[PDB]
Amino acid sequence: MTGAVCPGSFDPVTLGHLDVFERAAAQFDEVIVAVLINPNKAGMFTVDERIEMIRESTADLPNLRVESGQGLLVDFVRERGLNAIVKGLRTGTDFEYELQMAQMNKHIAGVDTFFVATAPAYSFVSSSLAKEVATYGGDVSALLPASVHQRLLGKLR
Amino acid sequence: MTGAVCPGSFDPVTLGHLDVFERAAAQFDEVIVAVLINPNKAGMFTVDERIEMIRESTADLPNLRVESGQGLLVDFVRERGLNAIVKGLRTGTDFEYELQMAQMNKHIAGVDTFFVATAPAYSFVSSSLAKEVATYGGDVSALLPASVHQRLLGKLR
Amino acid sequence: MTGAVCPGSFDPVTLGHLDVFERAAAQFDEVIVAVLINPNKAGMFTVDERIEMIRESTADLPNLRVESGQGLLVDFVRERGLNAIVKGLRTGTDFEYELQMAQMNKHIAGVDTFFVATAPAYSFVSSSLAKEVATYGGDVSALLPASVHQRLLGKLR
Amino acid sequence: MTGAVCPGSFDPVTLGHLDVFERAAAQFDEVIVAVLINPNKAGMFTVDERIEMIRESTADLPNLRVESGQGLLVDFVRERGLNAIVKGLRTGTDFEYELQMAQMNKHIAGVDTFFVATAPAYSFVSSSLAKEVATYGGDVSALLPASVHQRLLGKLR
Amino acid sequence: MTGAVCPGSFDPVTLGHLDVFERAAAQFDEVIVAVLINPNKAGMFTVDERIEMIRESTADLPNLRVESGQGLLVDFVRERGLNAIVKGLRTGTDFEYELQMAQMNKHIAGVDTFFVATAPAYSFVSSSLAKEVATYGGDVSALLPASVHQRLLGKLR
Amino acid sequence: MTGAVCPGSFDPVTLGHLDVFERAAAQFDEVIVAVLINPNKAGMFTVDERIEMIRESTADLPNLRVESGQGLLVDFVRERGLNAIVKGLRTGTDFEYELQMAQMNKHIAGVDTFFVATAPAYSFVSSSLAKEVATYGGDVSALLPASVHQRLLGKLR
C-alpha cells in the first residue's frame, strides 16, 4: 500500500543516490525513481541512458521502478496514487531551498517530503561535481556505480 | 508491513508534533510514538500524563500507538521489529545535531532517520517555548491540542 | 521623520513581500518600495507592470510609495534622505549573501539594513517559485495578491 | 511617534550592543533598552549596575532610555505602547532560535522583530566571552565601553 | 620551524580527533595536542588518563606531543612560541561559536585558527555522543581508538 | 619543509585574500597562490594582470609565489610536491560547497584543506561585489590593495 517517489535529474546517478534509493525501498512498499527532465536543457546523458544506468544498479531492489517525467513533481507523484517524496541530503545540499520546495509542494498538492541523509562515504559526491572532477581526470570510480563510471568517461572522450 | 517510530519527550505534545505524527501515520503501516523519559530531568507532565495527551490528540490515527521508553532510541525501534525513525523539523531545530544523531543511529543499529518539516503554522511552537509563554500568561491555544491547553492551564494554576 | 526602503525585483510582488511592506509601513513614518531593474534578466513583468501591481496591493498604506531604481541601492536610499533598508526573510533566503551586502552597504554609505521574517503562511512563496508552479498549472492563488494572480494568469495564457 | 525595544541581559553591555542601540536610536523616534532579569543565573553585575553602565554609555542618545523588565518581552514592549523589537546579530548568535522567538512573539502579541548585524569590529564580542577572556587576563578593552571595562576589572580584582 | 596546537578536552579522544592530529602532523613541523582542563568540572577521565589514551594512539606520529593546560588557549599556544591552532570540524560542530572564538583569539593574541573537516567515516562521533551511546550499550568500538574503547566501558561499569 | 596552496580567481585580489595569504605565509614554509583561470568565463583582468596585482600586494612575503593554473586544483597542488590547500572564509562564503570540495579533494588526491576566516574588517569584500560597487561609483578603496584600486578605476574608465 505504502509508497514514495525519489526524484532527481540523475545525470548521472551516483552512489549517494543509490544509498537513498535502497533506504526508501527498505521502508516503503513501492518506490518510483522519477527522472525529471527539463525539455529545454540537454544534460550529459539522454533520458534512456539515465534510466538504464539506474536500472542496472538497482536490480537487487524488486520493489523499485524507474520512470521519467517533467513539469510538477507533485503531479508525477499524485498521478501514481502516492503522496510522498523521499529526497537525499548530502554535503552541499541547498537545504533551505529543499525546505521551500517541500512546503510549497505540501501546500499545492498535499504531498509530504521526507529527507534522509546519505551515508558518510557517499556524502560529498554529486552528479555535477563528479562530472567536473572526471572532466579534468580525477578518479571518481569509487563514488559511482559500475553502470555509470566508464559510460561517463566515454561521454567525456 | 512498514513502520516508523516518532521520538520525543512531548512535555507537552504540540500541534507541531501532531502534524508530524499525522504524516508518519499516513505514510507507514504502523507508527509508534516513543515518549522518551529522562530519570534526571523530570518535566512538567508525568509520563502517563504525556501519553494520555498524545492519545487524546491522535484518536483518529488507528495505526499509531503511544509507548514510553528509556535508554537507546535505536533499541526501542529494533525491539519493535522496525528500523526507521521519523523526526520533525521546526524553526529552532538544531538540525546539525539531528544529523549527527541520525548518522550515529544508522551506524550503531542500521536504523534510518527520515526528517519532515512541520507545517508553517506550527513551525515556531516547541514544548519548552509553549510552557514559557503560557507561564507568563501568553496565549498559545492555537498552537496546542485543545485538551493539552486545558491541562497546561491546570498545572500552572 | 523616520523612513526605510524596501528593495526587490518584485516580478511579481507576493504576499510575502506585502507582509514585509505592511510591517515597514507600520514602524516607519515613510516607506519607499524600490523596484530595482536589471540588465537582464528582463522578467515576466515590465517595470511599470511591477509598479502598478505593488501600488494596487498597497492602496491601504498611505505612507508607502513605489519607485523604480537602477544602480546602487544605497544611492537610491540616500538620494531620498534616508539611510535604512528593510529586507524580508523567507524560507530559501540566501541570508549569508544578504549579510555580506548589508555590511558592504553600511561601509560604503552608512545605510543600515533591518531584516524581518515574513509570516509563516507566506514564508515559502518567492516570485520565481510562484511563476514556476503557476506555469505548470499549480494553484498559487493563496500566495499572491488577488490582482497579481489574475495578471499572472494573463501572462501565461 | 515610532519606537522600538532593544532587549538583552547586558551583563555587561558591549560595544556590539551599543552599536545596535545607536542604529536603533538613529532610525526610531524612541528606543527603550530592556534589561531582562533572570531567575538565575544571577550575573556578574546587578540589574542597577547593568542599567547604569548602559546609561553611562548612551549619554549621547537623547531618545534612548533604559529600564529593567521581567516576564514576557512582548508585554514589556506592548505596555509601553510599542510593537517593535530591534535585535542585534553577531558571530555566534543562535539565529534559528531568534527566528523562532520572533515568530512566536508576532503570533502572541503582534510585535515585529527587526534584526540588524553589528559592525564587523564588534561582531565577535559577547558579554559571556568578554567576561571569560578578561577573567584569564585577556585584553578586551577595545570591545567594551571604557566605563564598563573599568567596572569589569573591579569585579575581577 | 612551523607548528600548531590541536586543542580539546579529549574526554575521551576519538578517531575524529586522531584524524585531525594526523593531518596536522603531516602539515606542520611540530604539533602539540593541548588537553584543556576546567579545574571546576571533573569529566569522565582524569588528565593523566586522557593523555595516556592520546599517546597510545599517536605513537606513529614522531612530531606530535601531548600536554595539558587550563585558562586561555592563546597563552598555551604563545608560551610555546607558536601562533596557530588547528581545530577539527565534524557533524554537529557549532561552527558559529568556533568562528567567534577564532576571531577573538586573533584579536587578543594574534593567533590564527585553521579548521579542517574530519574524514566522513569519523564525522559523526564526538566525545559526548560516544559516552552517551556507550552508557546505554550502543557499539561505538569502530569510532574510538583501541586505547580508549575498553577503558571507556570500564568507567561505565 | 611544509607548504600550502591558496587558490582563487582573484579578479581582482582583495584585502580579504591578502589577509589569508599573510596567514598562510606565516604558518607554512612555502606558499603558492594559484590563479585558477577559466577558459569560458573571462573576467575583468587578464591572468597576467591578476598575477601582477597579487605580486604587488605580497611583496613583503618572500616565501609566497604566484602562479597560474588550469584544471584540477589537486593536480596543481601535487605537481608542486605539496598536499595542502589554505582557503579563506568570509561573509557570503558558500561553506557547505567548500566542505563538499574539501572532502572530494581529500578523497581523489589525499590533499588536506585548511580553512581560515579573514579578519572582520575584510570579511564582507569579494572580488565580484567590489567590482559591482565600483562600477556604480561606490568607494571600495579601504577594501582593496592601493595598486588594485588604481587599476580597477582604469578598467572602468
Side-chain angles (χ1 to χ4, degrees), chain E residues 2-3 19 23-24 26-29 83-84 86 89 95 99 102-103 106 110-120 123, chain F residues 1-3 19 23-24 26-29 83-84 86 89 95 99 102-103 106 110-120:
Chain E
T2 66
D19 183 41
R23 298 196 203 205
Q27 307 287 4
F28 294 85
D29 288 319
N83 56 5
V86 168
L89 302 177
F95 189 49
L99 288 171
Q103 301 298 51
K106 180 69 173 188
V111 171
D112 294 315
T113 301
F114 297 89
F115 300 98
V116 56
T118 196
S123 62
Chain F
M1 183 135 165
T2 66
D19 181 32
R23 298 181 201 217
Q27 308 291 359
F28 294 86
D29 289 315
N83 60 6
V86 168
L89 306 175
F95 189 46
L99 211 69
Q103 301 297 53
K106 179 70 173 184
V111 172
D112 293 319
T113 298
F114 299 93
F115 299 100
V116 58
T118 196

Side-chain angles (χ1 to χ4, degrees), chain C residues 39 42-59 61-69 71-108:
Chain C
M44 159 175 302
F45 297 97
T46 69
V47 180
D48 285 339
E49 291 180 315
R50 301 178 193 187
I51 292 171
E52 244 180 30
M53 281 187 297
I54 298 164
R55 288 200 180 125
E56 296 192 77
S57 317
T58 55
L61 306 172
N63 62 325
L64 182 148
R65 65 188 196 271
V66 188
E67 296 165 21
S68 63
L72 294 184
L73 173 60
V74 286
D75 285 331
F76 184 100
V77 179
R78 294 286 305 279
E79 293 174 352
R80 286 162 179 75
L82 305 174
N83 54 10
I85 294 160
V86 168
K87 190 76 138 284
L89 303 175
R90 57 166 174 85
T91 308
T93 293
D94 186 342
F95 189 45
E96 289 67 34
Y97 189 48
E98 291 296 331
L99 288 169
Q100 187 196 358
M101 285 189 291
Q103 300 300 54
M104 179 65 82
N105 284 337
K106 180 69 175 184
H107 175 77
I108 66 179

Side-chain angles (χ1 to χ4, degrees), chain E residues 30-40 42-87:
Chain E
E30 65 179 334
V31 174
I32 301 93
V33 176
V35 182
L36 299 174
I37 297 307
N38 181 348
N40 294 317
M44 164 174 296
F45 294 94
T46 69
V47 185
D48 41 301
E49 293 173 331
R50 299 184 201 188
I51 291 174
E52 187 180 70
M53 291 187 292
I54 294 156
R55 292 187 166 147
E56 289 177 7
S57 56
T58 56
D60 286 3
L61 302 179
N63 60 331
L64 183 145
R65 61 194 193 262
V66 189
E67 304 177 70
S68 72
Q70 50 191 66
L72 283 177
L73 174 57
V74 290
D75 287 335
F76 181 103
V77 179
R78 297 280 306 281
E79 75 191 350
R80 281 157 182 82
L82 298 177
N83 56 5
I85 297 158
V86 168
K87 178 71 187 171

Side-chain angles (χ1 to χ4, degrees), chain F residues 74-94:
Chain F
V74 289
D75 287 336
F76 181 103
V77 178
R78 278 186 130 184
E79 275 170 5
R80 288 161 177 73
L82 300 176
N83 60 6
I85 296 166
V86 168
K87 179 85 207 172
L89 306 175
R90 52 158 175 91
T91 309
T93 292
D94 186 342

Side-chain angles (χ1 to χ4, degrees), chain D residues 57-59 61-69 71-135:
Chain D
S57 317
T58 55
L61 306 172
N63 62 325
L64 182 148
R65 65 188 196 271
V66 188
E67 296 165 21
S68 63
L72 294 184
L73 173 60
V74 286
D75 285 331
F76 184 100
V77 179
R78 294 286 305 279
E79 293 174 352
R80 286 162 179 75
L82 305 174
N83 54 10
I85 294 160
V86 168
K87 190 76 138 284
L89 303 175
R90 57 166 174 85
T91 308
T93 293
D94 186 342
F95 189 45
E96 289 67 34
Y97 189 48
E98 291 296 331
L99 288 169
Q100 187 196 358
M101 285 189 291
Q103 300 300 54
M104 179 65 82
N105 284 337
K106 180 69 175 184
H107 175 77
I108 66 179
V111 173
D112 296 321
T113 301
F114 294 92
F115 299 98
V116 57
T118 194
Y122 303 129
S123 66
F124 57 86
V125 64
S126 68
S127 293
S128 293
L129 195 54
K131 284 181 297 192
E132 177 183 332
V133 170
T135 294

Side-chain angles (χ1 to χ4, degrees), chain A residues 2-3 19 23-24 26-29 83-84 86 89 95 99 102-103 106 111-120 123, chain B residues 1-3 19 23-24 26-29 83-84 86 89 95 99 102-103 106 110-120:
Chain A
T2 66
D19 183 41
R23 298 196 203 205
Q27 307 287 4
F28 294 85
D29 288 319
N83 56 5
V86 168
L89 302 177
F95 189 49
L99 288 171
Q103 301 298 51
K106 180 69 173 188
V111 171
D112 294 315
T113 301
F114 297 89
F115 300 98
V116 56
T118 196
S123 62
Chain B
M1 183 135 165
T2 66
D19 181 32
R23 298 181 201 217
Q27 308 291 359
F28 294 86
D29 289 315
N83 60 6
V86 168
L89 306 175
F95 189 46
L99 211 69
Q103 301 297 53
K106 179 70 173 184
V111 172
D112 293 319
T113 298
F114 299 93
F115 299 100
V116 58
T118 196

